[PDB]
Amino acid sequence: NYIERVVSINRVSKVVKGGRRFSFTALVIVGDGKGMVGVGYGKAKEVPAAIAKGVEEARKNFFRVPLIGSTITHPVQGEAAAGVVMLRPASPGTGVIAGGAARAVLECAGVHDILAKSLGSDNAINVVHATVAALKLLQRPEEVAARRGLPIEDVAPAGMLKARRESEALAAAAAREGSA
RNA sequence: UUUGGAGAGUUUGAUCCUGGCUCAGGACGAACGCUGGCGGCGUGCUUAACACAUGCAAGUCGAACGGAAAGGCCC
Numbered sequence: 001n002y003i004e005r006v007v008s009i010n011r012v013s014k015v016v017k018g019g020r021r022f023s024f025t026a027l028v029i030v031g032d033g034k035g036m037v038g039v040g041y042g043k044a045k046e047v048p049a050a051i052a053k054g055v056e057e058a059r060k061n062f063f064r065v066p067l068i069g070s071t072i073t074h075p076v077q078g079e080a081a082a083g084v085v086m087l088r089p090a091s092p093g094t095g096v097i098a099g100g101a102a103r104a105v106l107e108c109a110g111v112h113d114i115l116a117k118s119l120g121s122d123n124a125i126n127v128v129h130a131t132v133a134a135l136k137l138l139q140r141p142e143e144v145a146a147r148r149g150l151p152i153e154d155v156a157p158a159g160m161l162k163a164r165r166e167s168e169a170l171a172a173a174a175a176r177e178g179s180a
Numbered sequence: 181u182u183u184g185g186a187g188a189g190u191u192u193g194a195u196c197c198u199g200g201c202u203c204a205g206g207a208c209g210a211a212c213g214c215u216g217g218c219g220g221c222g223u224g225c226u227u228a229a230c231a232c233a234u235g236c237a238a239g240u241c242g243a244a245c246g247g248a249a250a251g252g253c254c255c
């Protein structure tokens with residue numbers, strides 16, 4: 001089960017000595033809803049071929065989201081492409097607050113609570129690149145502590161330890177219910 | 181040690197950037213246009229600090245005095 005979405009459809013054109021040659025380009029985002037993200041950019045002369053190319057490229061290119069239970073770990077300032085997209089977690093149930101392309105990519109990621117803002121070049125392609133880079137910039141507390149050579153309690157806050165323990169207990173309960 | 185950030189259209193044969201405009205949101209001591217049933221609770225000259233017909237919005241003491249004009253009683 002994968003989540004599919006389309007963000008923008010553009011009628012690109014090419015010129016020859018005879019006249020105008022039209023073409024179609026599409027960008028799609030694929031995700032499993034658990035924290036696995038794939039982006040695809042596909043070009044054709046017709047929408048079905050375009051979306052097929054986009055889906056294939058997205059299937060080729062994947063990326064994993066290290067989310068804590070339901071939300072993001074820490075605020076991230078994703079500076080890439082030409083747009084500035086700033087992501088940070090929030091209180092559970094607040095919702096994934098983001099623009100169009102960011103909305104699509106985060107919903108395909110499966111996150112449920114995020115605060116986002118795009119600060120320039122509202123173009124969908126650049127926004128998607130900036131969000132992907134923002135997720136790449138994300139760091140996870142366990143291997144952050146491993147890199148720093150200091151144990152978890154001496155690195156990460158007790159509140160996020162409590163949240164992680166609650167998330168682990170909920171995941172264990174869900175696994176038990178699914179097995180039974 | 182806890183609470184809360186959305187964008188989209190629009191320059192080009194085509195796109196990327198910058199950059200400008202516009203729209204989706206809430207609010208008013210508001211008004212005009214159609215329509216219109218009641219009840220409760222608020223609000224009411226933002227301009228002309230312009231002139232204002234009439235009547236109201238500042239009175240109380242005989243246990244302060246002299247008195248009795250108008251009411252009472254008694255000859």
Ligand SMILES: [Mg+2]
Nearest residue numbers: 078079080084
């Ligand atoms: Mg910078």
Ligand SMILES: [Mg+2]
Nearest residue numbers: 119120121122
């Ligand atoms: Mg901008």
Ligand SMILES: [Mg+2]
Nearest residue numbers: 120121122123
């Ligand atoms: Mg914009």
Ligand SMILES: [Mg+2]
Nearest residue numbers: 091094183184
């Ligand atoms: Mg709050």
Ligand SMILES: [Mg+2]
Nearest residue numbers: 189190191192
């Ligand atoms: Mg234009």
Ligand SMILES: [Mg+2]
Nearest residue numbers: 191192198199
């Ligand atoms: Mg130009």
Ligand SMILES: [Mg+2]
Nearest residue numbers: 190191192193
């Ligand atoms: Mg044009």
Ligand SMILES: [Mg+2]
Nearest residue numbers: 218219220221
């Ligand atoms: Mg009424």
Ligand SMILES: [Mg+2]
Nearest residue numbers: 221222223224
């Ligand atoms: Mg009233």
Ligand SMILES: [Mg+2]
Nearest residue numbers: 234235236237
């Ligand atoms: Mg008078």
Ligand SMILES: [Mg+2]
Nearest residue numbers: 239240241244
């Ligand atoms: Mg007096």
